[PDB]
Design a protein around this ligand. Structure first.
Ligand SMILES: *[C@@H]1O[C@H](CO)[C@@H](O[C@@H]2O[C@H](CO)[C@@H](O)[C@H](O)[C@H]2NC(C)=O)[C@H](O)[C@H]1NC(C)=O
Ligand SMILES: CC(C)CCC[C@@H](C)[C@H]1CC[C@H]2[C@@H]3CC=C4C[C@@H](O)CC[C@]4(C)[C@H]3CC[C@]12C
Ligand SMILES: *[C@@H]1O[C@H](CO)[C@@H](O)[C@H](O)[C@H]1NC(C)=O
Ligand SMILES: [K+]
Ligand SMILES: [K+]
Ligand SMILES: [K+]
Ligand SMILES: [Mg+2]
Lengths: 268, 39, 992
């Protein structure tokens, strides 16, 4: 033929069949032992998610949400993702004492449901009403963005203490139980309005620590609705929403490390 | 610890780099020694 | 074009002096007119040689920039700029990826260009050396007056004059001469002075006395002649053009390189476009379809391989430089290993090029002297009183002297003023009797008759050094038979005795044997003149026989030859044991050529020519079956009337071939004949008459000390110490580097698979990219470099000089067996070890292997800053990318770890590491430096930006260890099978 005879062509096939078969069987074996060394409830390493990311619902083309108020299908793209998220926080999804629980309607302290063990059933998560998100189809004019803190197993988000000076200096400082979120731009051509649990501009600490998908399915993380009823129009406004805390940090590279990058433009 | 389990989300990449560079250097020296056993 | 120059020349030495003048419109006495000479100048053109048109270095450099790998890397470099252009227009990408990767790849092409350019070097100044043989000026007779002119202004027809010490300015017809002798070594390779006279003495113009040639010099006397040829039209000017004009051609090693380039280029374009369409079918945007292709290019092309080859060659050439063997062309480092036939000059190559005493006949006994340079033999006789009598004649009846200031150099190497035979005798006595000058001071010469053409002997009368005598001793030497007709007694073991027919017959026997050995034989005799008949003041007349020259006492015979170099016989046998055929090709006479052939082992004992059979059986040569003769001796005059097909039959039908009295073109023809049969041929030589053959040879080797400038220009390799044993070393080195290149190539190729497979699974699986493009270049250009080079220092696995020369048609540098092992077996195991570490990193950060399938869409989505892992956690864009790049880093390090084992297995093709050992210090160096580089690239701060290399956790380093070990075991088991059964299965499938 090309290389060899039929007899040789066969033998080279019988070899590579057994050979690659063995190699596949060995590869699988090493994957088995790897998995055997891992927990079902907690990942081996968590230093790469460490400082929590802050992500929002409006799917930004490039950290930007520009549209026209005087146009219907101009914002119907951002309403798709906005709906996708809030559709999960339905009351019909949170039914019965299992696996949900009614928690303080005001920001409270942490809740420990034991260890990362299966020695108990599904760890009961705090309910969250999308109805706590006042004012927010969504904002056809002047968007109503929804913030979110990235989930990390066993992470206890710790707010800053009012020992020294603060950006939003001491205003509504629920020091003990709220992780604040203050959006900014100089360039003050807007109108910041925050909505959340208990009416506070933060995340209620009663939703922590997260026990993971395996130990807490259907779990709901707290949301923070933000509305920009800015009196300006037809210009790119670089708005940055920042979260503050002891376990919260940022990076010049990762522009989502505990903060937002939104470029709103109501070009109408 | 409980609420004070910050160490869980931390890794000393600084020491690791110091050690890694020490090792790389020493392996580089060892190599020179064996090569220079005759030039 | 040069087929005309490969033919024997035609001449006009047969014409009379007068007749020759009519042909050139010339005067025998007055010479040309100033006007007629200038007319002929403009007519024929200058008496000069024009160098052939060369290829500029520009075109030579750029021709490498387009050879398979460079072509693919160019397509990659441009395709980078393509994707970059498409980006800069569509969505403003502030990145530098495609732009920088395009710059990097273009640089890789340029630098790789320098390496191949350095390897494909051609240092040739043939025509320049020939031009150096034309004198600046010549002496001509014009308008009846002699004047010096620019030699280029010399034309056919003018009257030229030459004298001892000057170069022949052009081909001349001798019309007048006085004691003129010439050095024709340019045409023959033999430096013994040849007389020139107006008389025609041979039909063959290269042998006649009435022609003098350009490229030669007058050694003594004076001559006048008419110019018959000028410039390019001279006999050796044509040799110049032939030699300088010959097409170089591709080396065996070069052909091998291009061959695997085709193979690897083939699989590259195959998988390249095979997956380019496979991606579009899967609905991949052309924006991405090209990005994947660039990666495929980088994965398939072994970026550092061609440069490795060059470095391995260079390092092998450095070792040979350290044995006095200079390599002018890097590729010639390997040709000697692939050589199946050596065509060797004799004089100054196989031989020392110095008349040396070989045997002596005295006391009715043949004695042998030591002919070797360094005198590696033993003594023959010292005791016999006869010896001292013969020794005295050899010293006394000798007019040769050592040049001043030689006392530092060895006797046999020092320059001597005199003819070759007298120098030989001088050096013979000086060696075994101490200072000859002393013997010539103790015995003052009073009268002598120098060797005469008519007398055929030379005699001398000396004052006997003996005090009790202080009388007159007569000594003489000459033609053995002439000396015999002048002897009455023979000095036997001390005492004289009558010359009976018995001893006279033993003389003839001794004389015939020595002459049969191709040796020049001289007779020696002396006579103690009677005291009473010769007073202490008796005057001797040298002009008229004033003393007896008959009834003298015969002392002995001495024989001499230009002997082989000490190492030559043994080197020839070693070449022959390695299955290399050795042919002699010489300008010298057949009797001498044949005798040295037997001396060095070109013709082995018992082997006969057709002429030998005929003489032994006493039958006509036509009655001899030529197939009964494995040896042959072909004279150039017969070679001339043979067609190449008939030359091919000679080459095919004889194992032991001697081509004697060959011209320079004839040497070229013999070389081409050998090549025509498909053989790789080496030429060894030292003369300008070797230049064409040296050029045409696959590898020409010139002698460094004895070699002429031309020969060393025509060669690929120079033996700086004239050590012929270096050929044996060269062939051995050549074979070793050939095997080691295979090892180094397999090693380099093996790591291609773990660079290809990640890109494929990226498409077919939709998982995050396991390894990056930049990461690949960190391997092929970084870590694999020193290890791959180090394989060039591997010792032989067996006695390589015991095997036959490779068949260049069947035995390739890269074959299917190499690809099967590197791509199909070992590289495949490396790929898995890479993937394993990849799955380990991701799973330990929360992305278990199961959830990875079909996630790249959301993974690469820059706007999704919340991807959910297996544990329900949410990752931003840059966070997951850090883990991904950490995956690139550990996959990279996994390659390094699996290359550890590969380096050790590529060490040996057959033998076990437990047999070959770990005595390669460069290899061990490679292991340490490779690992140091990898660690540095991962842990050095800032490398996460420039190369996207991230620090690895200690446990990460060990992921591929079980795969590294399986490689070592697998290959060790496999080679154990090879050795345990030379049959073929494992062998014919995987044995590189
Ligand atoms: C989650 O809540 C949303 C609230 O808008 C539900 O949307 C409803 O969709 C139905 C049918 O398309 C409409 O008739 C209603 O007007 C919507 N609102 C309400 C309050 O009922 C959505 O269907 C819910 N999703 C799930 C899975 O239950
Ligand atoms: C990523 C995976 C799916 C690709 C696997 C590719 C396999 C099928 C390839 C890789 C190397 C290949 C082999 C390389 C060498 C030889 C020897 C040659 O004389 C015949 C073909 C043969 C035997 C090839 C057959 C196919 C082969 C085994
Ligand atoms: C939000 O909606 C409420 C009614 O639910 C209305 O009273 C109020 O004006 C709205 N706020 C703004 C800022 O438009
Ligand atoms: K490669
Ligand atoms: K050559
Ligand atoms: K490679
Ligand atoms: Mg010679």
């Amino acid at each position: 033929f090309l290389g060899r005879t039929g007899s040789s062509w066969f033998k080279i096939f019988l070899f590579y069949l057994i050979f690659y078969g063995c190699l596949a069987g060995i590869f699988i074996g090493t994957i088995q032992v790897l998995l055997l060394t891992l927990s079902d409830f907690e990942p081996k390493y968590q230093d790469r998610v460490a400082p929590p990311g802050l992500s929002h619902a409006p799917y930004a083309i490039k950290t930007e949400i520009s549209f026209s108020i005087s146009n219907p299908k101009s914002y119907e793209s951002f309403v798709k993702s906005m709906h996708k998220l809030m559709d999960l926080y339905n009351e019909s999804s949170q039914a019965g004492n299992s696996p949900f629980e009614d928690c303080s309607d005001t920001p409270a302290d942490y809740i420990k449901r034991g260890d990362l063990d299966d020695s108990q059933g599904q760890k009961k998560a705090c309910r969250f009403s999308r109805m706590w998100l006042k004012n927010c189809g969504y904002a056809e004019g002047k968007p109503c963005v929804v913030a979110k803190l990235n989930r990390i197993i066993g992470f206890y988000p710790k707010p800053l203490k009012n020992t020294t000076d603060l950006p939003e200096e001491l205003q509504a400082n629920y020091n003990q139980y709220v992780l604040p979120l203050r959006c900014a731009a100089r360039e003050k051509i807007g109108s910041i309005e925050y909505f959340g649990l208990g009416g506070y501009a933060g995340f209620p600490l009663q939703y922590y620590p997260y026990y993971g998908k395996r130990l807490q399915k259907k779990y709901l993380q707290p949301l923070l609705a933000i509305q920009f009823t800015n009196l300006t129009q037809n210009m790119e406004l670089r708005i940055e929403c920042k979260v503050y805390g002891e376990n919260i940090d940022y990076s010049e590279k990762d522009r989502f490390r505990g903060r937002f990058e939104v470029k709103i433009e109501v070009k109408s | 610890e409980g609420p004070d389990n910050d160490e869980r989300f931390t890794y000393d990449y600084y020491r690791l780099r110091v050690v890694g560079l020490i090792v790389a250097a020493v392996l580089c020296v060892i190599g020179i020694i064996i090569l220079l056993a005759g030039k | 074009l040069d087929e005309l120059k490969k033919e024997v020349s035609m001449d006009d030495h047969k014409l009379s002096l007068d007749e020759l003048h009519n042909k050139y419109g010339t005067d025998l006495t007055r010479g040309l007119t100033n006007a007629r000479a200038k007319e002929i100048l403009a007519r024929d053109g200058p008496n000069s040689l024009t160098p052939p048109p060369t290829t500029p270095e520009w075109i030579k450099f750029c021709r490498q920039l387009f050879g398979g790998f460079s072509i693919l890397l160019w397509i990659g470099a441009i395709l980078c700029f393509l994707a970059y252009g498409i980006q800069a227009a569509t969505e403003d990408e502030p990145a530098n990826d495609n732009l920088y990767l395009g710059v990097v790849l273009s640089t890789v092409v340029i630098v790789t260009g320098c390496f191949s350019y350095y390897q494909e070097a051609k240092s040739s100044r043939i025509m320049d050396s020939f031009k150096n043989m034309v004198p600046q000026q010549a002496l001509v007779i014009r308008d009846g007056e002699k004047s010096t002119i620019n030699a280029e202004f010399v034309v056919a027809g003018d009257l030229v004059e030459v004298k001892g010490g000057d170069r022949i300015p052009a081909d001349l017809r001798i019309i007048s001469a006085h004691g003129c002798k010439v050095d024709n070594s340019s045409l023959t390779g033999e430096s013994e002075p040849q007389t020139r006279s107006p008389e025609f003495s041979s039909e063959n113009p290269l042998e006649t006395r009435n022609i003098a040639f350009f490229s030669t010099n007058c050694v003594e006397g004076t001559a006048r002649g008419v110019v018959v040829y000028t410039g390019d039209r001279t006999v050796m000017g044509r040799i110049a053009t032939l030699a300088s004009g010959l097409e170089v051609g591709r080396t065996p090693i070069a052909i091998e390189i291009e061959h695997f380039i085709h193979i690897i280029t083939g699989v590259a374009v195959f998988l390249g476009v095979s997956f380019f369409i496979l991606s579009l079918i899967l609905g991949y945007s052309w924006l991405e379809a090209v990005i994947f292709l660039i990666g495929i290019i980088v994965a398939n092309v072994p970026e550092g391989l061609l440069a490795t080859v060059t470095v391995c060659l260079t390092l092998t050439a450095k070792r040979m430089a350290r044995k006095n063997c200079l390599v002018k062309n890097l590729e010639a480092v390997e040709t000697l290993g692939s050589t199946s036939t050596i065509c060797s000059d004799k004089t100054g190559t196989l031989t020392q090029n110095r008349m040396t005493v070989a045997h002596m006949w005295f006391d009715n006994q043949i004695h042998e002297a030591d002919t070797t340079e360094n005198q590696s033999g033993a003594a023959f006789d010292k005791t016999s009183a006869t010896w001292s009598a013969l020794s005295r004649i050899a010293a006394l009846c000798n007019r040769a002297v050592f040049q001043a200031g030689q006392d530092n150099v060895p006797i046999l190497k020092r320059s001597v003023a005199g003819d070759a035979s007298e120098s030989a005798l001088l050096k013979c006595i000086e060696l075994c009797c101490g200072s000859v000058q002393g013997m010539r001071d103790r015995n003052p010469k009073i009268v002598e008759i120098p060797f005469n053409s008519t007398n055929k002997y030379q005699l001398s009368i000396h004052e006997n050094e003996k005090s009790s005598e202080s009388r007159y001793l007569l000594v003489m030497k000459g033609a053995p038979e002439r000396i015999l007709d002048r002897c009455s007694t023979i000095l036997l073991n001390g005492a004289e005795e009558p010359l009976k027919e018995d001893m006279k017959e033993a003389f003839q026997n001794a004389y015939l044997e020595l002459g049969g050995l191709g040796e020049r034989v001289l007779g020696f005799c002396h006579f103690a003149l009677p005291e009473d008949k010769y007073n202490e003041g008796y005057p001797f007349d040298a002009d008229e026989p004033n003393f007896p020259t008959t009834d003298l006492c015969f002392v002995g015979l001495m024989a001499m030859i230009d002997p082989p170099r000490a190492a030559v016989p043994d080197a020839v046998g070693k070449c022959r044991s390695a299955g290399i055929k050795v042919i002699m090709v010489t300008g010298d006479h057949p009797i001498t050529a044949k005798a040295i052939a037997k001396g060095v082992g070109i013709i082995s004992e018992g082997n006969e020519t057709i002429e030998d059979i005929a003489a032994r059986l006493n039958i006509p040569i036509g009655q001899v079956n030529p197939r009964d003769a494995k040896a042959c001796v072909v004279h150039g005059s017969d070679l001339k009337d043979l067609s190449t097909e008939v030359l091919d039959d000679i080459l095919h039908y004889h194992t032991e071939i001697v081509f004697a009295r060959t011209s320079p073109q004839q040497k070229l023809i013999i070389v081409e004949g050998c090549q025509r049969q498909g053989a790789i041929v080496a030429v060894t030589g030292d003369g300008v008459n070797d230049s064409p053959a040296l050029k045409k040879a696959d590898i020409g080797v010139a002698m460094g000390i004895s070699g002429s400038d031309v020969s060393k220009q025509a060669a690929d390799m120079i033996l700086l110490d004239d050590n012929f044993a270096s050929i044996v070393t060269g062939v051995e080195e050549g074979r070793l580097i050939f095997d080691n290149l295979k090892k180094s190539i397999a090693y380099t190729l093996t790591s291609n698979i773990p660079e290809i497979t990640p890109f494929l699974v990226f498409i077919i699986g939709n998982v995050p990219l396991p390894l990056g493009t930049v990461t690949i270049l960190c391997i092929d250009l970084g870590t694999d470099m020193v290890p791959a080079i180090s394989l060039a220092y591997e010792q032989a696995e067996s006695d390589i000089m015991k095997r036959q020369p490779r068949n260049p048609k069947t035995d390739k540098l890269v074959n299917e067996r190499l690809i099967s092992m590197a791509y199909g077996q070992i590289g495949m195991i490396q790929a898995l070890g890479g993937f394993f570490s990849y799955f380990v990193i991701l799973a330990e950060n929360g992305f278990l292997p199961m959830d990875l399938i079909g996630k790249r869409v959301r993974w690469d989505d820059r706007w999704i800053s919340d991807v959910e892992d297996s544990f329900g956690q949410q990752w931003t864009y840059e966070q997951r990318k850090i883990v991904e790049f950490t995956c690139h880093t550990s996959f990279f390090i996994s390659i390094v770890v699996v290359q550890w084992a590969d380096l050790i297995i590529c060490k040996t093709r057959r033998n076990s590491i437990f047999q070959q050992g770990m005595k390669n210090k460069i290899l061990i160096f490679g292991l340490f430096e490779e690992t140091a580089l990898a660690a540095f690239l991962s842990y050095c701060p800032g490398t996460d930006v420039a190369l996207r290399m991230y620090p690895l956790k200690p446990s990460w380093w060990f992921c591929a260890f079980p795969y590294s070990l399986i490689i070592f075991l697998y290959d060790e088991m496999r080679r154990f099978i090879i050795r345990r059964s030379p049959g073929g299965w494992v062998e014919q499938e995987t044995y590189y």
